Symmetry: C3
Subunit: 334 residues, 3 copies
């Protein structure tokens, strides 16, 4: 019995965009890291207009929470589908090896639970998502996806092999929704999931999202829920998109070090303006803030950002650097 | 006369997803590698519903067959357009240099043939496709595309310069089709290619495929035609998309080493969950299987995969590794 | 006063695809490089059919001109919005740090000007674009975007750290337009920008461009305005797309060295057939021509290229190399 001799540590997850506490450099040997998530089907208002969908969530949020482990830890997930839900669900970890990432082993009807263990053999950020046979994109595009970060045991490294240490981390999950439209263009609503299914499929088959949002709704990462930092702070932004390409961009900043396809054995790309995270991937960008003020963090299809919802904000405190940027002559009459 | 002094070797092509026999490390000096392909316009049923299109093929298949040579070999292609076809065709090799990849030199009316030679000066997997002036996307999106692999003379190498040797290779060609739709959404059929052309153009201009398939049809790489491997086997999957981006993903596995844009002088990306193959590119992923069972291989726009057709299967034999993954508690009642 | 002690140099911009004169290796220490651009709202015919839009331009062109500086120069832009325009405009440089890339500091009503300075701290090609709060994608997709190249002080380097020196440089700006369509599919025209705004938003929300063009119009980089080179010449092609992914490809050639996401501290990708430039990015490809004749340079979604406009030409002079490619048997009767 190898695994029974290992330490167990129980993690208590937090709601995105926050991330549960962890240590970048592993302070122990390999562990069995225990997580519990409870599936919740719930109504969610996703825009300023009040559009309401039936979301399918891990742990009550879109995205599901970020799990964090180290390479060669074991992830042990207790997945609970309470009897107050209506549908069968499961979970596929892109971090895992075998059984469709776990999906073949985790099919839970309402009123059931299961516990899956897998060894996190590859370092990176990875998508996880529900994937019930025959209804995969419906569950994913109903919000039933999140991410897991598998840190190298010795933490992150730059392109030269020197340490990169973040002061803060955020998890931005980006969700494409396909709210069914009638022939005048208004959303339709449905009375049961079975009654909704064919028009969900029809809406998905357009390949044209109605909404593309961060943290589950238009504007979710703004106002009192803007992301925060201070000048000089090193920030890692993990970004996932389980179904569709995105192109993140920090307006007024950069990705100083970017793993666009999320896998830490590779050297990061330096000095990115914008990067492509393919659908079905998590990526990660590291930035050291150099200026205070408001930033926007967007998918840089600017229609997707500013019309469909894929935009959030940072509020950054600290001192303005006029060497880096200044208004020499403020806007005024010619 | 340099080239006439070189060995000639005739290759007999095989139908995708299989690949003609070759040697990873070159066992001879440079050669003139002789290929023959016969263009075939044919009706193809592309989905479970019986939707039938007029496909334009190299060698009778969608995709066309994978050609394999080594760097600095010469590729000599005899391209035959029999008089039983109706259209002019040609061929552009992305591996080649000059004359629009060969397209300017290979225009063949029905009843004609031609022979093109080019030097394969750059190692990688590359798209080839038909490209007749003024009707390029129509031919490509009618299936008239494949790929060529130009191996380094000393075979594949990892990011550290150590050998990577595959045990098996498969070629997955992914095809976006644009079957014209009437205003209720049913497909239209046509009586001649000229009568079809304007509505093909209209359908293409939507930028929304009706079908996205592997090996020419929904489900083609499933059932008795699933891809196969054994635990411990090293597999190279070449994947091409001549017209539109894709994002391959092995469900339950990874791309251990990935040349997402297909060019072997570059170090591979390690440990990919998903990778972006741009339209107009071939990529290649190397994986060593670690678990038995069924895998799905998909474009990870899961709508494209599970609703539009971009999904195939592996059946993998061998021993299950409970250290890598296990069900600790099988699904059961709370 | 550090900056007032630096040399000032005034640059006179040129119209794309040409690029103002500069030195690859910096011949001076850091400078304040002075640019002036005058915003022009103007009617533009964008296709062969005569479709006319109201373009929003920097300096009268779509794209705006390419600015060129070196790392750690200061860019000082005088941005003029004459009173003959109707709208508020600004500028965001992806090369810059702070204040939304400058956009927060550069809001100019008609009849106003402003001068912004920023330090070009990161080497690469970068997008710049207008971004007025609440109307960002409308301005960008009306053509109000260009690029800036920040060269390393010691010029470009290959993957091994050896110099790469271009003989010629071109700037291809690729623009997605969303011309509003009525229910039969014809374009609509508008009488004022305010009257156009809602249907511009509706057209953009389809995520389906009506036109995708190089240098502002279908065919702009063809005929007397084809790009030119000679066999043996080293050419850098800078390519930007401020809003939507593209996949450039030189038909009959390659990208010998490609910074697909545009940032020169990273080693280039070698031997690319096609590469993905994410929306919101500039990329750069270096190629040494080896064959004469006509080439096409395209977005390799071939529908986007040949039906929607994303195609230009090179005319290359010099000697044909039959070792690289030859017609062994010209097209003729079977
Ligand atoms: O609801 N804001 O447009
Ligand atoms: O510990 N090897 O998967
Ligand atoms: O926080 N150490 O770099
Ligand atoms: O276009 N993204 O899948
Ligand atoms: O960088 N603003 O799109
Ligand atoms: O996975 N490389 O970012
Ligand atoms: O024909 N299967 O849905
Ligand atoms: O053999 N040089 O192309
Ligand atoms: O098959 N040799 O690794
Ligand atoms: O969206 N692919 O061309
Ligand atoms: O990994 N299943 O999409
Ligand atoms: O072409 N690099 O995969
Ligand atoms: O106007 N040319 O199709
Ligand atoms: O010169 N440091 O931004
Ligand atoms: O132009 N010097 O390579
Ligand atoms: O599909 N490009 O944003
Ligand atoms: O390479 N011609 O698409
Ligand atoms: O930004 N790397 O091309
Ligand atoms: Cu589910
Ligand atoms: Cu998946
Ligand atoms: Cu053809
Ligand atoms: Cu091509
Ligand atoms: Cu503007
Ligand atoms: Cu921007």
């Amino acid at each position: 019995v190898d695994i029974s001799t290992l330490p167990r540590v129980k993690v208590d997850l937090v709601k995105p965009p926050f991330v549960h506490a962890h240590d970048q450099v592993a302070k122990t040997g390999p562990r069995v890291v225990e997580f519990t998530m409870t599936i919740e089907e719930k109504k969610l208002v996703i825009d300023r207009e009040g559009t309401e969908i039936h979301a399918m969530t891990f742990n009550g949020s879109v995205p599901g929470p970020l799990m964090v482990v180290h390479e060669n830890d074991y992830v042990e997930l207790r997945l609970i589908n309470p009897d107050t839900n209506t549908l069968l669900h499961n979970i596929d970890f892109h971090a895992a090896t075998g059984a469709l990432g776990g999906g073949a082993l985790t099919q839970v009807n309402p009123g059931e639970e299961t516990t899956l263990r897998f060894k996190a053999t590859k370092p990176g950020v990875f998508v996880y998502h529900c994937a019930p046979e025959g209804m995969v994109p419906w569950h994913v595009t109903s919000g039933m996806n999140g991410a897991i970060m598998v840190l190298p045991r010795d933490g992150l490294k730059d392109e030269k092999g020197q340490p990169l240490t973040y002061d803060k981390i955020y998890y931005v999950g980006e969700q494409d929704f396909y709210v069914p439209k009638d022939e005048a263009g208004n959303y339709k609503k449905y009375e049961t999931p079975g009654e909704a299914y064919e028009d969900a499929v029809k809406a998905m088959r357009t390949l044209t999202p109605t909404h593309i949002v961060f943290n589950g709704a238009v504007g979710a990462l703004t106002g009192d829920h803007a992301l925060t930092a201070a000048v000089g702070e090193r920030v890692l932004v993990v970004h996932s998109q389980a179904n569709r390409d995105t192109r993140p961009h920090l307006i007024g900043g950069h990705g100083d070090y970017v793993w666009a396809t999320g896998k830490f054995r590779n050297p990061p790309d330096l000095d990115q303006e914008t990067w492509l995270i393919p659908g079905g991937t998590a990526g990660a960008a590291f930035y050291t803030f150099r200026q205070p003020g408001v930033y926007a963090y967007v998918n840089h299809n600017l229609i997707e950002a500013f019309e469909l919802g894929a935009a959030g904000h940072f509020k950054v405190t600290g001192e303005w650097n006029d060497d880096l940027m200044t208004s020499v002559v403020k806007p005024a009459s010619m």
